[PDB]
Subunit: 116 residues, 4 copies
């Protein structure tokens, strides 16, 4: 990622938040698709949905963070990540993709809470 | 828009919120580009930035609203729209694109506040 | 939508393309969620996936169209819409949400092909 | 990034493409804002615009790549990155943010061309 490089070269920490929003975005988008592909998919609906929302909010939060609504947006992104960690945590026993994503969600929650 | 058609045919008002999020998304994306094209662009930086953020948040809010983080997300989208109305309102005298967008922002703010 | 209002007030048809990209975006996002909620969800995986991709591409295509990659992007958005119409058409007999979305996809395909 | 972790744990190289799409997304979003903040902003309009489009296409391309339109989408994302490298390359002498972003664009172009 080039968050740090770019944030020092602009004419006018948070770095961690941005790295993580894009990381967590990609990851939940991956997890939605993985859950969608499972045989027990019918049981994963809420998880897929949350993953889709967490992807969307993290892209949004990370783009904004790359440029104020930011405080608010990072609170929201923190709330979302937590919702999505909790759900992805449930499935961590049976699905390795939800262990991986649940931890990425945890780390991005942390990162949004301390950015505010 | 087909928000209303689709929301009645799902196996499990808010309609207005969704219509407006996508409307206001496109509009602020249009306004960012219009301000970017102005001769007084150097004076419009904050407005362009807000427009970009309002586009991003409204897509995000509208997608989520099409599928919970929703309450929170709609509060955030309400806060953003207001921020962006206020700024786009400043420029309504001189720029017709900011009159149009400032009103779209007002109407979407309204719509998010009453969706919550 | 305010595509037409805004495109006439910028300091520097396609309108139909933009209206439709945002319409079709919201619609496929709605259809993904509707299919996700079906009992036969396990059979709808490819459709949900395509709907997610068509939502993403249409937002992208519509934002770009609101501001060149445009020709290319509209070809891609045309290809996607067609892929997603074809799949959503399959399910039009059994699911009213896929009849609605399959037609929105058809109309946006048309609109991208004639924008190029 | 957790592209690699997740792509091995799904029930059904490209990794490089995805890492890079999200990297290049964040970077061009950063560069748009940096150019927007420059005194010579009036001269950077085309660059800002391209950066905005490259951000949008790369998010889109990376999300899709995380889940077919993919071949097509990656061609488009390759075309965009190149357009945006070329423009960001122009400004590499005077602006360090455009040197950084022009190279991120180059590396993501490469990565999309070999993913296809
Ligand atoms: Cu973040
Ligand atoms: Cu996040
Ligand atoms: Cu985030
Ligand atoms: Cu995530
Ligand atoms: Cu998952
Ligand atoms: Cu899941
Ligand atoms: Cu998630
Ligand atoms: Cu997230
Ligand atoms: Cu988050
Ligand atoms: Cu997250
Ligand atoms: Cu999750
Ligand atoms: Cu899960
Ligand atoms: Cu999972
Ligand atoms: Cu998960
Ligand atoms: Cu996660
Ligand atoms: Cu997850
Ligand atoms: Cu998440
Ligand atoms: Cu976060
Ligand atoms: Cu964050
Ligand atoms: Cu809304
Ligand atoms: Cu809105
Ligand atoms: Cu909104
Ligand atoms: Cu707006
Ligand atoms: Cu504007
Ligand atoms: Cu403006
Ligand atoms: Cu706005
Ligand atoms: Cu907005
Ligand atoms: Cu809003
Ligand atoms: Cu708005
Ligand atoms: Cu505004
Ligand atoms: Cu303005
Ligand atoms: Cu304006
Ligand atoms: Cu405006
Ligand atoms: Cu506005
Ligand atoms: Cu505006
Ligand atoms: Cu707005
Ligand atoms: Cu709204
Ligand atoms: Cu709303
Ligand atoms: Cu379009
Ligand atoms: Cu479309
Ligand atoms: Cu489109
Ligand atoms: Cu669609
Ligand atoms: Cu559907
Ligand atoms: Cu479907
Ligand atoms: Cu679709
Ligand atoms: Cu589409
Ligand atoms: Cu399309
Ligand atoms: Cu479409
Ligand atoms: Cu479809
Ligand atoms: Cu379908
Ligand atoms: Cu359907
Ligand atoms: Cu469908
Ligand atoms: Cu459709
Ligand atoms: Cu559809
Ligand atoms: Cu579609
Ligand atoms: Cu279209
Ligand atoms: Cu189109
Ligand atoms: Cu990529
Ligand atoms: Cu890229
Ligand atoms: Cu890309
Ligand atoms: Cu980029
Ligand atoms: Cu830049
Ligand atoms: Cu630039
Ligand atoms: Cu770029
Ligand atoms: Cu890009
Ligand atoms: Cu690219
Ligand atoms: Cu790129
Ligand atoms: Cu560039
Ligand atoms: Cu540049
Ligand atoms: Cu630059
Ligand atoms: Cu640049
Ligand atoms: Cu770049
Ligand atoms: Cu750039
Ligand atoms: Cu780029
Ligand atoms: Cu790329
Ligand atoms: Cu790529």
């Amino acid at each position: 990622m080039h968050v740090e490089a770019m944030i020092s070269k602009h004419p006018q920490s948070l770095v961690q938040c941005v790295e993580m929003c894009f990381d967590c975005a990609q990851t939940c988008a991956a997890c939605a698709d993985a859950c969608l592909g499972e045989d027990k998919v019918a049981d994963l609906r809420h998880c897929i949905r949350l993953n889709l929302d967490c992807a969307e909010i993290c892209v949004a939060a990370g783009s904004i963070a790359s440029r104020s609504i930011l405080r608010t947006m990072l609170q929201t992104c923190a709330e979302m990540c937590r919702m999505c960690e909790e759900e992805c945590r449930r499935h961590a026993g049976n699905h390795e993709h939800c262990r991986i994503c649940a931890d990425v969600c945890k780390e991005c929650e942390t990162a949004c809470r301390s950015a505010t």
